[PDB]
């Protein structure tokens, strides 16, 4: 196509949400998604979670996973039949959504409302969304290593990485994960379970004192490290990689403190950089504090260019300028971007949530500014039988926790197995709650949103914690 009315760059979560938002507000709209990957839009969270807890050899082909409750779901947002071909898109009655797979936008000419693809073709647009997501960080130690080291290092991001790494876990004796964050720890538990059944080894190493140690308070970071160790994973905290080489066919990791780790394959999960390469020819601002395209309240980066998802550095209604790596944010900001591309002129006021499941038994949710260097008030309780991701998925029918929590924010609230197993952690700044972590507490994110939006100087967080830990039959009106 040489001209399209709506052009979405990137075919991930934010792009799909915007495409559907445009079609709802502008029925008959013609929307083209350009996607460098071969697959139609799909969600990422199952790649590190339910797709590993199957023992079904066919999921690498069907990309249908069993949710924790046993209900199957496609990783794809919509089947192919939902889309029209790019060739038909200009002509077909009542418009549609087409995806040009296997094509990368390599240049964006803001001034001329035009993109250029890797195959040399050019497309002009009336409205454009940048939904390019991010690019995984590597380690300099792996960068300096040889081609073989790099060929045996997985930056875990996409379906292709699930497929290749799942095969490796069936075939090798030792896999090492570098990175202690949520994704690394999800993979550690996933691989850990596979290795326990096979008799093989999984190592996880990171520089913090314990898993998710930059986010969780020390008590709960250490508990998480022991949970991962009970899955059979050798967890090595306080580990700084100095070099990686090959010796006798195996990868040899040398840590700064002198320890060595011999392993067969490496998975690095040490974060990402927003993909801002299309800023290179001008017209688009970038953020240096956090990364990403700087956008205004309506998610605009230029007169007819919007940005959504991981690539956007947006103005958080509570926290100011920030970027997130949240499925929830990609969905909500993508939808809003699509609305503003059809003239809604609405600000992005959503408080994005995050969640991580380490398995059916352990999950976390996070909202706002969740930094372990802030003072935290943790209020903990014994877990009941329903305080785990599997029960939450059984109650709601989805494992996509932003869907079971919903995007909404509570408006009014009415109040009519050997130690701690859940709790709420309040992150304080200026005597105010600026972030919350929920540990095995589900269906209360709307309440966490309300507490953070109120921003009052709370005494008796002992009492507020009861809204998360204790009260069951709360009657709440959501918005
Ligand atoms: C393994 C994994 C597990 C996750 N688990 C969770 C979880 O449990 N909870 C949670 O809240 N979040 C989770 N996340 C984060 C969440 O998936 C992301 O926030 C979400 O994918 C962001 O969507 P996006 O559309 O902004 O970016 P993406 O979904 O990455 O989409 C970007 C797409 O655009 C393509 N692209 C980039 N540049 C170009 C270009 N120039 N031309 C064409 N195409 C281009 C990319 O190849 C990619 O397909 C997880 C992420 C990963 C990788």
Swiss-Prot record:
<keyword id="KW-0963">Cytoplasm</keyword>
<dbReference type="GO" id="GO:0005737">
    <property type="term" value="C:cytoplasm"/>
</dbReference>
<feature type="binding site">
    <location>
        <position position="355"/>
    </location>
    <ligand>
        <name>FAD</name>
    </ligand>
</feature>
<feature type="modified residue" description="Phosphoserine">
    <location>
        <position position="243"/>
    </location>
</feature>
<keyword id="KW-0520">NAD</keyword>
<feature type="cross-link" description="Glycyl lysine isopeptide (Lys-Gly) (interchain with G-Cter in ubiquitin)">
    <location>
        <position position="127"/>
    </location>
</feature>
<keyword id="KW-0144">Charcot-Marie-Tooth disease</keyword>
<keyword id="KW-0007">Acetylation</keyword>
<dbReference type="GO" id="GO:1902065">
    <property type="term" value="P:response to L-glutamate"/>
</dbReference>
<feature type="compositionally biased region" description="Polar residues">
    <location>
        <begin position="385"/>
        <end position="401"/>
    </location>
</feature>
<dbReference type="GO" id="GO:0048471">
    <property type="term" value="C:perinuclear region of cytoplasm"/>
</dbReference>
<feature type="binding site">
    <location>
        <position position="310"/>
    </location>
    <ligand>
        <name>FAD</name>
    </ligand>
</feature>
<feature type="binding site">
    <location>
        <position position="105"/>
    </location>
    <ligand>
        <name>FAD</name>
    </ligand>
</feature>
<dbReference type="GO" id="GO:0005758">
    <property type="term" value="C:mitochondrial intermembrane space"/>
</dbReference>
<protein>
    <recommendedName>
        <fullName>Apoptosis-inducing factor 1, mitochondrial</fullName>
        <ecNumber>1.6.99.-</ecNumber>
    </recommendedName>
</protein>
<feature type="binding site">
    <location>
        <position position="44"/>
    </location>
    <ligand>
        <name>FAD</name>
    </ligand>
</feature>
<dbReference type="GO" id="GO:0160203">
    <property type="term" value="P:mitochondrial disulfide relay system"/>
</dbReference>
<feature type="region of interest" description="FAD-dependent oxidoreductase">
    <location>
        <begin position="6"/>
        <end position="355"/>
    </location>
</feature>
<dbReference type="GO" id="GO:0071949">
    <property type="term" value="F:FAD binding"/>
</dbReference>
<keyword id="KW-0999">Mitochondrion inner membrane</keyword>
<feature type="binding site">
    <location>
        <position position="49"/>
    </location>
    <ligand>
        <name>FAD</name>
    </ligand>
</feature>
<dbReference type="GO" id="GO:0071392">
    <property type="term" value="P:cellular response to estradiol stimulus"/>
</dbReference>
<dbReference type="GO" id="GO:0033108">
    <property type="term" value="P:mitochondrial respiratory chain complex assembly"/>
</dbReference>
<keyword id="KW-0809">Transit peptide</keyword>
<dbReference type="GO" id="GO:0005634">
    <property type="term" value="C:nucleus"/>
</dbReference>
<feature type="modified residue" description="Phosphoserine">
    <location>
        <position position="140"/>
    </location>
</feature>
<keyword id="KW-0209">Deafness</keyword>
<dbReference type="GO" id="GO:0005739">
    <property type="term" value="C:mitochondrion"/>
</dbReference>
<keyword id="KW-0274">FAD</keyword>
<dbReference type="GO" id="GO:0071732">
    <property type="term" value="P:cellular response to nitric oxide"/>
</dbReference>
<dbReference type="GO" id="GO:0006915">
    <property type="term" value="P:apoptotic process"/>
</dbReference>
<comment type="function">
    <text>Functions both as NADH oxidoreductase and as regulator of apoptosis. In response to apoptotic stimuli, it is released from the mitochondrion intermembrane space into the cytosol and to the nucleus, where it functions as a proapoptotic factor in a caspase-independent pathway. Release into the cytoplasm is mediated upon binding to poly-ADP-ribose chains. The soluble form (AIFsol) found in the nucleus induces 'parthanatos' i.e. caspase-independent fragmentation of chromosomal DNA. Binds to DNA in a sequence-independent manner.</text>
</comment>
<dbReference type="GO" id="GO:0005743">
    <property type="term" value="C:mitochondrial inner membrane"/>
</dbReference>
<feature type="short sequence motif" description="Nuclear localization signal">
    <location>
        <begin position="318"/>
        <end position="323"/>
    </location>
</feature>
<keyword id="KW-0832">Ubl conjugation</keyword>
<feature type="modified residue" description="Phosphoserine">
    <location>
        <position position="402"/>
    </location>
</feature>
<keyword id="KW-0496">Mitochondrion</keyword>
<dbReference type="GO" id="GO:0070301">
    <property type="term" value="P:cellular response to hydrogen peroxide"/>
</dbReference>
<dbReference type="GO" id="GO:1904045">
    <property type="term" value="P:cellular response to aldosterone"/>
</dbReference>
<keyword id="KW-0053">Apoptosis</keyword>
<feature type="binding site">
    <location>
        <begin position="10"/>
        <end position="14"/>
    </location>
    <ligand>
        <name>FAD</name>
    </ligand>
</feature>
<feature type="binding site">
    <location>
        <begin position="36"/>
        <end position="37"/>
    </location>
    <ligand>
        <name>FAD</name>
    </ligand>
</feature>
